[PDB]
Short mmCIF file of C-alpha atoms (C1' of nucleotides) in Angstrom, two decimals:
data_model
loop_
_atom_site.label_atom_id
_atom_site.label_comp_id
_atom_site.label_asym_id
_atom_site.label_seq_id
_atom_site.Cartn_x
_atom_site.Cartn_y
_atom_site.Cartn_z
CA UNK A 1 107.90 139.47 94.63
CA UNK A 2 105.04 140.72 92.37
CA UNK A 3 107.31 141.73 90.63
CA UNK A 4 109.17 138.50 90.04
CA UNK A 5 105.61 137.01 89.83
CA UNK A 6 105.80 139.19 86.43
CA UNK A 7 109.28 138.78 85.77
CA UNK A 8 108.32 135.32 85.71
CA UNK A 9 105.34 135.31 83.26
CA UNK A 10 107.01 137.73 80.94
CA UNK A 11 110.26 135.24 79.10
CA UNK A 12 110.03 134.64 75.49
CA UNK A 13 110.06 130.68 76.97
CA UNK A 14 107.21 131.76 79.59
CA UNK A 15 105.00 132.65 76.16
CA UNK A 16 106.41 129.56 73.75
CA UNK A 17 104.73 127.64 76.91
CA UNK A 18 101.48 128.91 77.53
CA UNK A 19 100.77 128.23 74.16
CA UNK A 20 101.80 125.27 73.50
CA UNK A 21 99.90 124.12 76.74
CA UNK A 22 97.55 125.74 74.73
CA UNK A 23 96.90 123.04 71.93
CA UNK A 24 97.50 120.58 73.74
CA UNK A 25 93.83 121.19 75.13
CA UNK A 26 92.47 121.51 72.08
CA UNK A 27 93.42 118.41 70.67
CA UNK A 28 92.88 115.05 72.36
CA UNK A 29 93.02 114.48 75.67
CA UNK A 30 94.44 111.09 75.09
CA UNK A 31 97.09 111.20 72.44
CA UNK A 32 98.69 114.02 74.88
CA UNK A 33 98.45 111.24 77.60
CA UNK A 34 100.44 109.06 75.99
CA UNK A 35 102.86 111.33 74.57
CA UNK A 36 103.36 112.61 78.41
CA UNK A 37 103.93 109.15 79.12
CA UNK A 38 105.81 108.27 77.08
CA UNK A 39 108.15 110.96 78.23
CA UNK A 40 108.21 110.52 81.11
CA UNK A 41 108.79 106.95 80.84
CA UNK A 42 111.68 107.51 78.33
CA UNK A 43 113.00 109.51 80.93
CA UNK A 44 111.69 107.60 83.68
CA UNK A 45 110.53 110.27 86.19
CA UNK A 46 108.53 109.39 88.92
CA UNK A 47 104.83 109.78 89.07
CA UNK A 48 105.16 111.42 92.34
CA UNK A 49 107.87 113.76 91.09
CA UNK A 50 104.39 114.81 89.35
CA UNK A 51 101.55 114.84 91.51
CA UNK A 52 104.28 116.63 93.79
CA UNK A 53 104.81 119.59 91.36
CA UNK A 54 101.07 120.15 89.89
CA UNK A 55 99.17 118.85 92.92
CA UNK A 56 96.88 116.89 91.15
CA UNK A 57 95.57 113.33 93.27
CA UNK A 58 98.31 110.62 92.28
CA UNK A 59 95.56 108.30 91.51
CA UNK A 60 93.37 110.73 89.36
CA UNK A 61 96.42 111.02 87.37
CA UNK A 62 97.91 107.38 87.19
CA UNK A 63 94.19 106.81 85.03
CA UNK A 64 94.07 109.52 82.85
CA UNK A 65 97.60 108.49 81.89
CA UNK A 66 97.26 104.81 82.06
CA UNK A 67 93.62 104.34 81.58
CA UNK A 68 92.34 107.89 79.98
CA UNK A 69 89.78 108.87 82.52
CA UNK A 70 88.78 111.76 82.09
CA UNK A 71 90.74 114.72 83.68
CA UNK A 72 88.90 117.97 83.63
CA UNK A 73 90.56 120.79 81.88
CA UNK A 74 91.99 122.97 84.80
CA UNK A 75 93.79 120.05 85.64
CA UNK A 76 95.05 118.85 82.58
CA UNK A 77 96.23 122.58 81.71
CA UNK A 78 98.25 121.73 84.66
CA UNK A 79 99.61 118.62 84.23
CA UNK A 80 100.62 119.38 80.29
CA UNK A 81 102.21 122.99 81.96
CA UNK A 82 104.43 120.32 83.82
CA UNK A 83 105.53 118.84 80.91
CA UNK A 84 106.55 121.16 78.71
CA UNK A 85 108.13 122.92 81.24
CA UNK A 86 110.07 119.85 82.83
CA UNK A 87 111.17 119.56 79.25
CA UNK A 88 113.23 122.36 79.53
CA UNK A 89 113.98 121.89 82.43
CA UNK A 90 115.16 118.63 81.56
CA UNK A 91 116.53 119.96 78.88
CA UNK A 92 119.24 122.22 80.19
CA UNK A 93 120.56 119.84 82.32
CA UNK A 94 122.08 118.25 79.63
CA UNK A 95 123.16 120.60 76.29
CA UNK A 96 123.67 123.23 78.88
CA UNK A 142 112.07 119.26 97.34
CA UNK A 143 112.43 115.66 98.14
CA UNK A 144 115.19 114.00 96.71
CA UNK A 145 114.25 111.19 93.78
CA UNK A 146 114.76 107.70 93.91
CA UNK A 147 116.65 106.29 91.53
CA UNK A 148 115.06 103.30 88.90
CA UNK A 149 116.51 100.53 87.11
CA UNK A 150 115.14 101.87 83.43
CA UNK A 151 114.34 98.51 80.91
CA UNK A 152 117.59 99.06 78.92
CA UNK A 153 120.18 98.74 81.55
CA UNK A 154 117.39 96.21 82.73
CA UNK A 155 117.93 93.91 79.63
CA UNK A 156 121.77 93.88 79.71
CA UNK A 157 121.69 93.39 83.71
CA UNK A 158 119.38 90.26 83.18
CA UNK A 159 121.41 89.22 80.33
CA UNK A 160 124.26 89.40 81.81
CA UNK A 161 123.10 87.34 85.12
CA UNK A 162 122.57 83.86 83.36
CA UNK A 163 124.97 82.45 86.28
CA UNK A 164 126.44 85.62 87.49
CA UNK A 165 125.69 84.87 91.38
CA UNK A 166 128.71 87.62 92.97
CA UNK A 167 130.09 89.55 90.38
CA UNK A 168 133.70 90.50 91.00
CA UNK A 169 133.48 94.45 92.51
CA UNK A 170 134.99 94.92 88.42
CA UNK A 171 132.72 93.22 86.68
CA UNK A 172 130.02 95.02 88.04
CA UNK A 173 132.06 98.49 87.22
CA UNK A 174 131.67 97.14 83.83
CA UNK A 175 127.98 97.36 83.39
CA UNK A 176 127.51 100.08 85.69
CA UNK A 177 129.27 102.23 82.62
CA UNK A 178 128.01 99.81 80.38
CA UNK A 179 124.16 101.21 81.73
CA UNK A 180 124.52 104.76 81.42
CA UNK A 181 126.11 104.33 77.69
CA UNK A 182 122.45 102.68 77.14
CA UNK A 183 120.48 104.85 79.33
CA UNK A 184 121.81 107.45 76.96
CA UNK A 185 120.51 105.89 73.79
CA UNK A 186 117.45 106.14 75.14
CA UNK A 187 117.12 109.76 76.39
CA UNK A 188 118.65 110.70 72.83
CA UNK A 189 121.82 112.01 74.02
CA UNK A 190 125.69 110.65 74.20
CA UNK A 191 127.29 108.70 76.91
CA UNK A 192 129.63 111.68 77.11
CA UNK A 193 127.48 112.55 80.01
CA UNK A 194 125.74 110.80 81.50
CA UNK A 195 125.45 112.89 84.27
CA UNK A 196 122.50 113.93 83.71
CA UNK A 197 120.76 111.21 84.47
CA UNK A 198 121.05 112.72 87.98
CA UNK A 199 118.61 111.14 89.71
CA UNK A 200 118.99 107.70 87.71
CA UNK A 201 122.61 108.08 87.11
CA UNK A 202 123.81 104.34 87.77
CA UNK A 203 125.81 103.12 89.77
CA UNK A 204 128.00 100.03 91.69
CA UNK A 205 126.03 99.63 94.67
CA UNK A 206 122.87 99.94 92.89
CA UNK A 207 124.06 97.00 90.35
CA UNK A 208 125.45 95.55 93.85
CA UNK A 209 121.93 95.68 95.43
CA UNK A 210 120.54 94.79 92.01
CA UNK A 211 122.35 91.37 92.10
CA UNK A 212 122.11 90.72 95.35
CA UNK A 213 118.65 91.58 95.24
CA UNK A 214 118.34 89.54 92.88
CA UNK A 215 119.63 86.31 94.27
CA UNK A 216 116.80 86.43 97.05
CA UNK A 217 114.45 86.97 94.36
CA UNK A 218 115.07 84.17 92.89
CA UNK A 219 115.70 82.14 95.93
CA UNK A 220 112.51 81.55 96.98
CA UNK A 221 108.89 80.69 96.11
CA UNK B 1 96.97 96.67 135.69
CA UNK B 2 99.57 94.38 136.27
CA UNK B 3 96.56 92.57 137.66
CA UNK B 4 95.13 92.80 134.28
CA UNK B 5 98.45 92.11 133.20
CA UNK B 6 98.58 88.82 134.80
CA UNK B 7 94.66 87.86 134.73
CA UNK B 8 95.32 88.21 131.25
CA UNK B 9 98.14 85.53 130.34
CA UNK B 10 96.62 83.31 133.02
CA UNK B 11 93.19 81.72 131.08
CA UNK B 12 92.54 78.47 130.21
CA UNK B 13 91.99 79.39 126.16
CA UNK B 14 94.88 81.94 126.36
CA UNK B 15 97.12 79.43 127.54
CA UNK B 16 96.28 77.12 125.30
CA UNK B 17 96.77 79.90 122.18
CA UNK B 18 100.06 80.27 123.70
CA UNK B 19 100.54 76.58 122.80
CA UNK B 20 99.40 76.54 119.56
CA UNK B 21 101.40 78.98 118.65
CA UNK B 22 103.84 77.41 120.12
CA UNK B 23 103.67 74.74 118.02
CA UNK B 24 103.13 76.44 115.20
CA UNK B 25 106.65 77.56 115.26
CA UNK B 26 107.76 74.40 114.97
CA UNK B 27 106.24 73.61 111.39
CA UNK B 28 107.13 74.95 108.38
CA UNK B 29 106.96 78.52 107.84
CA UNK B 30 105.36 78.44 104.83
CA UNK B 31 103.13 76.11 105.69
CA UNK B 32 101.85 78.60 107.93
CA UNK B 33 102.17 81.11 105.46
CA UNK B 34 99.65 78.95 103.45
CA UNK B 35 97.31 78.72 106.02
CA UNK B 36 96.83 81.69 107.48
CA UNK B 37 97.23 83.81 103.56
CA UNK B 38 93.86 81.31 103.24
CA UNK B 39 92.30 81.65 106.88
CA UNK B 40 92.62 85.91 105.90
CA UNK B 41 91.73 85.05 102.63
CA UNK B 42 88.77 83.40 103.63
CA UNK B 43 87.11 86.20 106.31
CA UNK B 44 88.58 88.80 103.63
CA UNK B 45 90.99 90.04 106.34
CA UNK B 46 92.91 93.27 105.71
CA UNK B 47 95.96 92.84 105.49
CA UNK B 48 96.46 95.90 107.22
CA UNK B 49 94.74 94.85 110.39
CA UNK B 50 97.84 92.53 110.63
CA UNK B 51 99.80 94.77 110.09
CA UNK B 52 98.71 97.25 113.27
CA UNK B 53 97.96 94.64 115.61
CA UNK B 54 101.02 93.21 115.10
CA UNK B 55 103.25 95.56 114.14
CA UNK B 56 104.89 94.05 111.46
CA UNK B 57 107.06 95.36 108.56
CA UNK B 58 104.22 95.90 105.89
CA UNK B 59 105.61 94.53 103.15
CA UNK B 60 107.89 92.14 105.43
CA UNK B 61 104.52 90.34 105.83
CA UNK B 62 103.59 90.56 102.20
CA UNK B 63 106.41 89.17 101.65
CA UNK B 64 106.82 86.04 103.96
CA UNK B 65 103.32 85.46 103.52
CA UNK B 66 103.05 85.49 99.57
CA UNK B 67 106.94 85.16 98.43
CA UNK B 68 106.96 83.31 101.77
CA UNK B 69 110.00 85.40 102.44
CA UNK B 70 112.06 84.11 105.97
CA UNK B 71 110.78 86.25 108.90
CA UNK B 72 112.96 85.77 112.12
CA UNK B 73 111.07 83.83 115.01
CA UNK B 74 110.08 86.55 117.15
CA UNK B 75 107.88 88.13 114.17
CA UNK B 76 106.47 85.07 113.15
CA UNK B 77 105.81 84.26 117.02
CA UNK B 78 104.06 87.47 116.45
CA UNK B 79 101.96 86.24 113.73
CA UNK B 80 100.62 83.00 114.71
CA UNK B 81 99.38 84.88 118.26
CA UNK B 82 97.60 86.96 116.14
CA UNK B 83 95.94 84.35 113.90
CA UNK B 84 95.61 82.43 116.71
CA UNK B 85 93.35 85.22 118.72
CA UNK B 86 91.79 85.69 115.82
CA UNK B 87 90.29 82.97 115.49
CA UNK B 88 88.35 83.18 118.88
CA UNK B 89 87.78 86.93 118.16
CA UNK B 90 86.00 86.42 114.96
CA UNK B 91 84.55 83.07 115.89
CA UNK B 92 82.69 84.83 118.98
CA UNK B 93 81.24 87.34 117.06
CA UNK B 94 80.32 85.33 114.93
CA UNK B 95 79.30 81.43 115.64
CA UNK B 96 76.86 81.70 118.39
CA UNK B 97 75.96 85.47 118.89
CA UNK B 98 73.08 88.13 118.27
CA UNK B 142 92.39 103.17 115.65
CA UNK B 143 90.70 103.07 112.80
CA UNK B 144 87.43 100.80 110.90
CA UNK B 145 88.69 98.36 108.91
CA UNK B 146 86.73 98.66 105.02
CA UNK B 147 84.88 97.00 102.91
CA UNK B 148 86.29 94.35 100.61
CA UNK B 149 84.43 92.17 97.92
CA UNK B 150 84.76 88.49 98.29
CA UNK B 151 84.80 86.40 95.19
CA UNK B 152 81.97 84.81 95.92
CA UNK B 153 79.71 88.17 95.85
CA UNK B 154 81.67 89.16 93.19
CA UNK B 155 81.49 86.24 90.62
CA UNK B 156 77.82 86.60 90.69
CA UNK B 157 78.00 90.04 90.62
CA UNK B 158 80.27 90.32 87.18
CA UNK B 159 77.14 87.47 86.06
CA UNK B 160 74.43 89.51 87.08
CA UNK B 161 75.96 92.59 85.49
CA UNK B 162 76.71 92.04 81.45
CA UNK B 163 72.82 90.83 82.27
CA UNK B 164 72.00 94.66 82.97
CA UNK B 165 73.95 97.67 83.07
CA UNK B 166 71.90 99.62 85.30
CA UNK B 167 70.06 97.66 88.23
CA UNK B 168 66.98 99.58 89.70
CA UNK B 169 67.04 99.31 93.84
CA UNK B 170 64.98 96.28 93.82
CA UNK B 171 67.15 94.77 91.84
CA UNK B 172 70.42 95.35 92.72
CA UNK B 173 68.58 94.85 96.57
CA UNK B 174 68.13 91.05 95.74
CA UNK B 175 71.46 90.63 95.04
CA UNK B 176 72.27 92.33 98.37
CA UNK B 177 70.95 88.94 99.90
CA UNK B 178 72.83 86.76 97.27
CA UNK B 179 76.12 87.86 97.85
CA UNK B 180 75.39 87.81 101.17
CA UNK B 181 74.68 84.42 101.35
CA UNK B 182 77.84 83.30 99.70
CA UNK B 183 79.46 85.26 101.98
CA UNK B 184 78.19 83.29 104.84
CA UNK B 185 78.67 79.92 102.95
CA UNK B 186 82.63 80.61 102.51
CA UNK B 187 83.46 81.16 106.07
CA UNK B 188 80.98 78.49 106.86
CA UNK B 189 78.07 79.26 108.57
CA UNK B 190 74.58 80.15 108.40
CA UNK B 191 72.93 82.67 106.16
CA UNK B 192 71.65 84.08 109.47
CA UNK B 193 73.38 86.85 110.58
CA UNK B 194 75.10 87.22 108.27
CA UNK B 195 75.21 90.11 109.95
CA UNK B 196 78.86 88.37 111.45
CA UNK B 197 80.22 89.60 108.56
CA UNK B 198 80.52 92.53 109.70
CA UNK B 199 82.65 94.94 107.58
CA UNK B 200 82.79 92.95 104.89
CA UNK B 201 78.65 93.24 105.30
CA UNK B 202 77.29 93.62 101.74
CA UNK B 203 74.76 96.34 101.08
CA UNK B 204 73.31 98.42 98.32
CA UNK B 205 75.00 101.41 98.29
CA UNK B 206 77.91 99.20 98.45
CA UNK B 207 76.54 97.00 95.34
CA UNK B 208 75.64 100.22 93.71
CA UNK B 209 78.52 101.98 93.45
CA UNK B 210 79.63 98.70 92.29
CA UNK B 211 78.09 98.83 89.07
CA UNK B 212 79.04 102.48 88.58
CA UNK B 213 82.47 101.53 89.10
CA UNK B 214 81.88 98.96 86.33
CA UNK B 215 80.39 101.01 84.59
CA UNK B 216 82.13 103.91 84.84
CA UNK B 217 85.17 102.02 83.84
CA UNK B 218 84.92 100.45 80.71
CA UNK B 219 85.83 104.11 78.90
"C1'" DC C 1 68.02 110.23 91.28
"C1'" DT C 2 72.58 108.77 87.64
"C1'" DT C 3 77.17 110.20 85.47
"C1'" DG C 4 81.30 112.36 85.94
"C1'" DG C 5 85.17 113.87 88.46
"C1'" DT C 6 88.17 113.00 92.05
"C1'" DT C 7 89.49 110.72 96.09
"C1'" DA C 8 91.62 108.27 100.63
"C1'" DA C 9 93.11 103.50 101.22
"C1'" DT C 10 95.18 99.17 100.42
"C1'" DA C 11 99.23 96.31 99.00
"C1'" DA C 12 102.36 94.27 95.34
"C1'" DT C 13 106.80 95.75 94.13
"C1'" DT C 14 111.03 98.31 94.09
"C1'" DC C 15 115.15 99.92 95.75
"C1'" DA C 16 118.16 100.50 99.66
"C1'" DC C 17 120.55 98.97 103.85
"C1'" DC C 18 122.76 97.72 108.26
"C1'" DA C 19 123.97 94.50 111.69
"C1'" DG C 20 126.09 90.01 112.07
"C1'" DG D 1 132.42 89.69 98.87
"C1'" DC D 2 129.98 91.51 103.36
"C1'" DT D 3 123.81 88.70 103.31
"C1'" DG D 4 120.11 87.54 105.71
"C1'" DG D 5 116.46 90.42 107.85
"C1'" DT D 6 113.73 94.49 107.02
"C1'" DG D 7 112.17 98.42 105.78
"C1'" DA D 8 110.55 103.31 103.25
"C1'" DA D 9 108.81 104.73 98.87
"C1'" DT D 10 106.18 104.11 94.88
"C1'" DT D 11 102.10 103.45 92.01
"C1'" DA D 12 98.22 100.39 90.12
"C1'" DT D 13 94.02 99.28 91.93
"C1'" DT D 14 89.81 99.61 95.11
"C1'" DA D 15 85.79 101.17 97.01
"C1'" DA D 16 83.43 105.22 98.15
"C1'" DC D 17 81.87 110.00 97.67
"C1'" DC D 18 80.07 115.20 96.21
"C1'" DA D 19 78.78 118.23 93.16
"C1'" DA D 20 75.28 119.61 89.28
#
DNA sequence: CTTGGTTAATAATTCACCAG
DNA sequence: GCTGGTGAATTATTAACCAA
């Protein structure tokens, strides 16, 4: 233990962070904000997936990211520490507790809505298309290649979620 | 207790509410939806107190009322007995008198007057905001028509200063 | 006092889902 | 191609604090 507590803090990574958590609180509070953001929106994480690991209140932090007020230091020493590390993180699980739920990112958004212009039932295949058809796009975005896509983990796509997308999306539609 | 029970769905104006809501189920379901989204609307009605009372899928009823999403007949029977009671309940307290506590909610009304009164002066000093305690207040009373006396009916929704002054600060406060 | 941080609560939306 | 009903999670937004 104690000893892992130092084992922990000692990495050549470990140091890279600190110190890059480092500037980030020098320089402004708000151009990290959106940077963060935009991460995390690339990668589309959820927020809670971030008040979860740093324990900061989900609505303090929704406004300092999506309005700028004011966080503190402590606090925002934590949130960037997320970041960078969930970079890694994140970054591993690619070159190299609760469970997320997944989300419909814009790109496979775009094609799904594109592809809907009188699409009531697709055929079981169709679908199959445009599930891989997704996760070729998702991949654009995340700046890797479709060669895997299995990364996405969490938001990997797939037929049941186009199925519920559709069929969500005729009840959508359906009323008013 | 079944005496209760019984003494309970055996009054004149509880049999009648039975009726009414019988009839309500009769009509169209959104045209319900419509009226009671307004009669909340009006009083400024939580929508969680619905929720509770009834017992009603939260967003099922966010749904079907806004969306005006299909909600089976039990559910809805569910709903108009609730408006229905309502009614009585808030007209008691209200027309001719002297688990958890529903909170405060700003009514257009107060509010219109309050965004007017504000880019008029940023930082209201007790007698002031304290006049516009009264104001609001008043409109209050006017929407849910009845008399600026006791307005006191209002209740929760009851306007105040602290109330009115934290809602400059949070007008203030939020234009960083 | 008042800002300045920080918060518990509410509710529109989002995704899943099972029983006819 | 299950398909209407529902429902748990999520996160922008609201209305209040408590510390200095």
């Amino acid at each position: 233990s104690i000893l892992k507590e130092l084992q922990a803090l000692n990495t050549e990574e470990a140091a890279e962070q600190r110190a890059e958590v480092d500037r980030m609180l020098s320089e402004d509070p708000w151009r990290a904000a959106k940077m963060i953001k935009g991460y995390m929106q690339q990668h589309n994480i959820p927020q809670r997936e971030v008040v979860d690991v740093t324990g900061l209140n989900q609505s303090h932090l929704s406004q300092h990211l999506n309005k700028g007020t004011p966080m503190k230091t402590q606090k925002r020493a934590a949130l960037y520490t997320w970041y960078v590390r969930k970079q890694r993180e994140i970054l591993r699980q690619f070159n190299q507790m609760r469970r997320n739920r997944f989300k419909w990112g814009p790109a496979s958004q775009q094609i799904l809505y594109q592809a809907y212009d009188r699409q009531k039932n697709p055929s079981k295949e169709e679908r199959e298309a445009l599930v891989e058809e997704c996760n070729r796009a998702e991949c654009l975005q995340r700046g890797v290649s479709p060669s895997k896509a299995h990364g996405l983990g969490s938001n990997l796509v797939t037929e049941v979620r186009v199925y519920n997308w559709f069929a969500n999306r005729r009840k959508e539609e359906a009323f008013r």
